[PDB]
Amino acid sequence: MRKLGLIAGGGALPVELASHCEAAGRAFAVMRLRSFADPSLDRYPGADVGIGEFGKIFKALRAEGCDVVCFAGNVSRPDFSALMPDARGLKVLPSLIVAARKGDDALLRRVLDEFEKEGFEIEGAHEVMGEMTLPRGRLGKVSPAPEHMADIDKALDVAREIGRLDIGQGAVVCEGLVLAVEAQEGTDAMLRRVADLPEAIRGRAERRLGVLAKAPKPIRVALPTIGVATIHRAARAGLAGIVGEAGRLLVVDREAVIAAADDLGLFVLGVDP
Amino acid sequence: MRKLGLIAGGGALPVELASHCEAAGRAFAVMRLRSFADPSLDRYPGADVGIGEFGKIFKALRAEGCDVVCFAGNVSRPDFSALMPDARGLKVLPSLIVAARKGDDALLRRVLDEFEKEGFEIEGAHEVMGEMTLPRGRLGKVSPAPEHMADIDKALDVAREIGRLDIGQGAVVCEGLVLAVEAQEGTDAMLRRVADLPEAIRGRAERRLGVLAKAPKPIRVALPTIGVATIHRAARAGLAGIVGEAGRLLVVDREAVIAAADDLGLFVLGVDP
Ligand SMILES: CCCCCCCCCCC[C@@H](O)CC(=O)N[C@H]1[C@@H](OP(=O)(O)OP(=O)(O)OC[C@H]2O[C@@H](n3ccc(=O)[nH]c3=O)[C@H](O)[C@@H]2O)O[C@H](CO)[C@@H](O)[C@@H]1OC(=O)C[C@H](O)CCCCCCCCCCC
Ligand SMILES: CCCCCCCCCCC[C@@H](O)CC(=O)N[C@H]1[C@@H](OP(=O)(O)OP(=O)(O)OC[C@H]2O[C@@H](n3ccc(=O)[nH]c3=O)[C@H](O)[C@@H]2O)O[C@H](CO)[C@@H](O)[C@@H]1OC(=O)C[C@H](O)CCCCCCCCCCC
């Protein structure tokens, strides 16, 4: 439970720790990922890291005084060819590019284990799970109706098997029919596709059918995330709700998520893994 | 090998038999599916069938003189509530709506077996497989490079497992990464999504990486189809080629498909099931 070194991806999380770093006074250090990091993190202690500057990040976290790092934010796999220069990233690079061939987890695997080599003992999940994780049972006031339990179990099953092939982690099931499965497009894009599907095979704004399920990605530090946008994007699609495994989903801004889900009439539910 | 009764879906196939029915002189009868059938099939012998007019289609094929029917064209599952009226379709309806809950094959299953009850012995595949099926090995002049064989085996594997869950039948793999998987959106929409993905994880117009694979849907009469549009839609996405199981893919307009694939530099290849 030592602290802190922040490897900045993109999106709210990296600010949702800066807001939280205003608490304990670590004082954190932000390794801003040059290509992803928000400028709301401009001139916090730390540096700007080209995602290839693998050895600069190491000397920087070391420099400041870091023994414990947290991976927050959205990151994409690079187009490797066009990568930035750093000679320390090479001793481990092939084992990345090679694991990159497996999937978006075998790559993530090597990178994080690579840190653990350098003496940095890390855990990005527990730092943020004890703040903003999905709890068991409903999150808002809406519960699932009987007419929604079968889609719940099935959406989840599909998400898990899609998830073990390293394809994606999200899937959408309406009345037993799988409407969509997430790959590289992202959850928002996937929900958008669903709303675009003919109404004959989906719910609508006054009779909601269907569930979005996100799940890992089997045994964590990178876990499937949802936020407010997910709610109304889920809503447009006609979905009745969203499910995840308890302690295996990140809910950014859980109160506005609660507010939004409730007004729209959508459950959000954490099932037991 | 008797003939003929044509259950008209939509798209070229139902005309690609009318063109072919100009041959043997059956003379065919077209049960135009009221909601899908092209008007290029207006006033050919036969009728106009509301997809729910299940008993009208039966009396009509019987009326004309049909003992052998062929299912050609694209069809969607209806929004059942808004269906058209026919009292003969009811004795079998629940077993449709019920099988509809499984997937877009358990439903297709019951419907076609339902015909086989009425004395109509059918086979829509062999009628069209002996004209326009995918042959083993390349179809055009382009072959796959070494750099494309691993995506070929993997795209196929994924298509098959996606296919056994009754999700979809198409998938797209580029350098080992699954870019996309088809569900209800359709192949064209799926290829469009891929072209929309960041270029960092896909091929491009001068260095083509990746494969689209379509496959059944395990043991046929309804088989995954491709045509010219598939070629240039595949092309925009940066794909290097398209693969299917020999005798388990329909190639509409195989010569224009050949012409198009070749100019664009894309292989099309039938592997052994
Ligand atoms: C050579 C370089 C090699 C680098 C390795 C490249 C590996 C490529 C694959 C890595 C793995 C990567 O695909 C996954 C990833 O980056 N994780 C992050 C990812 O979650 P996800 O489920 O993939 O998002 P999704 O968009 O599908 O649905 C969200 C919905 O919510 C909504 N949403 C989101 C944010 C928000 O503020 N509000 C909101 O409503 C939004 O509208 C959506 O409806 O977006 C979430 C939103 O922010 C983050 O919380 C999460 O963050 C995490 O879970 C942790 C994160 O994975 C750490 C970064 C990976 C490791 C980086 C270390 C390597 C750098 C080292 C350099 C020296
Ligand atoms: C209560 C009513 C219950 C009704 C049951 C509803 C079941 C719902 C699910 C049924 C199963 C249904 O999803 C599948 C289906 O309808 N099959 C048909 C379906 O193939 P698919 O692979 O699903 O197309 P896809 O769009 O994903 O990629 C294509 C690419 O090619 C390109 N393309 C296409 C056409 C063309 O002319 N040119 C071209 O370049 C195009 O740009 C694309 O890049 O589109 C192809 C393009 O036309 C047809 O060749 C095929 O046709 C078949 O294989 C046979 C067809 O499945 C027979 C119809 C099903 C049985 C109907 C009997 C029920 C009625 C009885 C009433 C009494």
Q: Report the length, in residues, of chain B.
A: 273
Q: Which two tokens stand for residue B36?
A: 């899908």
Is residue B121 packed enough to be buried (19+ CB in 10 Å), middle (13-18) or exposed (0-12)?
Answer: exposed
Q: CA–CA distance from B72 to each of A226, B12, B113, B124 (Å)?
A: 43, 9, 16, 7
Contact partners, residue A35, CB within 8 Å, separation at least 6: A50, A51
Name residue, tokens 């549009």: B229
**How buried is residue A262: exposed, middle or buried, by Cβ count under 10 Å (0-12/13-18/19+)?**
middle
Count other C-beta atoms under 10 Å from residue A226's C-beta.
Answer: 24
- B127 Cα to the center of ligand 1, angstroms: 50
- C-alpha B42/C-alpha B31 separation (Å) is 10
DSSP E strands in A156-249: the ranges are 170-174, 177-181, 211-214, 225-226, 241-245
Q: Decide the pairing of beta strands B46-49 and B30-33.
A: parallel
Query: Which stretches does DSSP call E strand in chain A?
Result: 5-8, 30-33, 46-49, 69-72, 137-138, 170-174, 177-181, 211-214, 225-226, 241-245, 250-251, 267-271
Answer yes or no: are the C-beta atoms of A70 and A222 closer than 8 Å: no
Q: Which of A161, A178, A193, A209 to mutate to test the interface with B (most CBs of B within 10 A)?
A: A178
- Please name the residues in contact with B184: beta carbons below 8 A apart, sequence gap of 6 or more: A177, A178, A179, A180, A197, A201, B104, B168
Q: After which residues is chain B broken (C to N over 2.5 A)?
A: 219
How far is the alpha carbon of A45 from chain B, nearest alpha carbon, in Å? 31
d(CA B264, CA B259): 9
CB count in 10 Å sphere of residue B254: 20
Q: Are strands B211-214 and B170-174 parallel, antiparallel or unpaired?
A: antiparallel
Given an 8 Å threshold on Cβ–Cβ distance, is A102 in contact with B181? no
Phi, psi (deg, nearest 5) at residue A83: -65, 160
Test A158 with B165 for CB contact under 8 angstroms. yes
- Locate B22 and state its tokens: 């100009």
Q: Which of B103, B179, B183 faces A181 most closely, judged by CB atoms? A: B183
Residues contacting A1, CB < 8 A, separation 6+ = none
Q: Which domains does chain B have, with CATH numbers?
A: 1-129 (3.40.50.20), 130-273 (3.40.140.80)
Q: Is B66 exposed, middle or buried (CB count within 10 Å of its CB: 0-12, 13-18, 19+)? A: buried
Residue B37 token pair:
């059938």
**Helix-, strand-, coil-residue percentages of chain B, each rounded to 5:** 40, 20, 40
Alpha carbon dihedral B246, B249, B250, B253, in 10-degree steps, equals: -60
**Cα A270 to Cα A261: distance, rounded to the nearest angstrom:** 14
Give the full edge-to-edge strand order of the sheet including A5-8. A46-49, A30-33, A5-8, A69-72
Q: How was this structure determined?
A: X-ray
Q: Helix (H, G, I), strand (E, B), or coil: what is residue B160?
A: helix
Cβ within 8 Å, pair B179-A181: no
* Rounded Cα distance, A230 and A225, in Å: 9
Identity of residue B40? S
Q: Which of A101, A158, A196 sits opposite B175 (nearest CB)?
A: A101
Residue B148 one-letter amino acid: H
Q: What is the resolution of this structure in A?
A: 2.5
User: 3-class DSSP state for residue B54?
Assistant: helix
Integer Cα distance of B250 and B130 in angstroms = 11
Query: With a 6 A CB cut-off, is B220 part of the ligand 2 pocket?
Result: no
Distance in angstroms (rounded) separating the CA atoms of residues B178 and A104: 10
Place of tokens 């690579």: A114
For ligand 1, the distance from its centroid to the CA atom of residue A194, given in whole angstroms, is: 22
- Which letter does DSSP use for residue B35 in this model? T
